[PDB]
Amino acid sequence: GSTVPYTITVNGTSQNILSNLTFNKNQNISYKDLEGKVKSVLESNRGITDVDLRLSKQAKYTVNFKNGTKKVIDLKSGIYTANLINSSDIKSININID
C-alpha cells in the first residue's frame, strides 16, 4: 500500500539500517500491531531478538507523523495506548537499541 522509511541505530554498530516498511494504505492500526512490524525488522536486519531487547539498556522507536507530531515507544513495555493510528499519517520511524 504505502512505504514508510525507517532507520535502526544500535550503539553496538557504526553502520545504521535504512529501509522501508510496507503498510496497507489508509488502515487503522494499533501500537501492538506496529510493535510486531518494528520487532520483525529489528530481528531480520540486525539479528536483534526479543531476548536482546530485554537484555538491552534501552530499546525504543519513534513514530514521526506527517503533521509534525511524534510518539516515542519503549519496546520493553507491555503497556500500550489505544492508540489506532492511521497508516497514512506515518511519515517515518526511527528505531534505537542501547
Side-chain angles (χ1 to χ4, degrees):
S2 65
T3 296
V4 172
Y6 72 87
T7 54
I8 298 179
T9 303
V10 185
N11 193 295
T13 170
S14 63
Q15 194 74 337
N16 296 177
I17 291 295
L18 174 55
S19 189
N20 273 303
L21 279 175
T22 300
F23 290 81
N24 286 126
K25 186 177 299 182
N26 187 43
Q27 176 172 50
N28 294 313
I29 65 177
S30 66
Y31 272 97
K32 180 62 181 180
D33 289 327
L34 189 50
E35 171 185 287
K37 296 182 64 60
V38 168
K39 283 186 175 186
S40 180
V41 296
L42 267 165
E43 190 172 355
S44 65
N45 306 320
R46 281 288 173 252
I48 294 175
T49 61
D50 244 81
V51 164
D52 296 305
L53 295 172
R54 293 199 290 282
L55 295 175
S56 74
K57 297 183 181 180
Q58 180 186 61
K60 65 179 185 58
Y61 75 85
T62 298
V63 182
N64 303 299
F65 297 101
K66 292 182 181 177
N67 67 359
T69 60
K70 67 186 177 187
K71 181 61 175 181
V72 186
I73 301 295
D74 186 334
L75 281 166
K76 292 183 180 181
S77 186
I79 299 301
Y80 308 85
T81 73
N83 235 323
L84 241 55
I85 59 182
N86 193 290
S87 61
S88 292
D89 295 337
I90 303 173
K91 181 175 181 180
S92 70
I93 295 172
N94 307 304
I95 302 165
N96 297 266
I97 304 301
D98 301 341

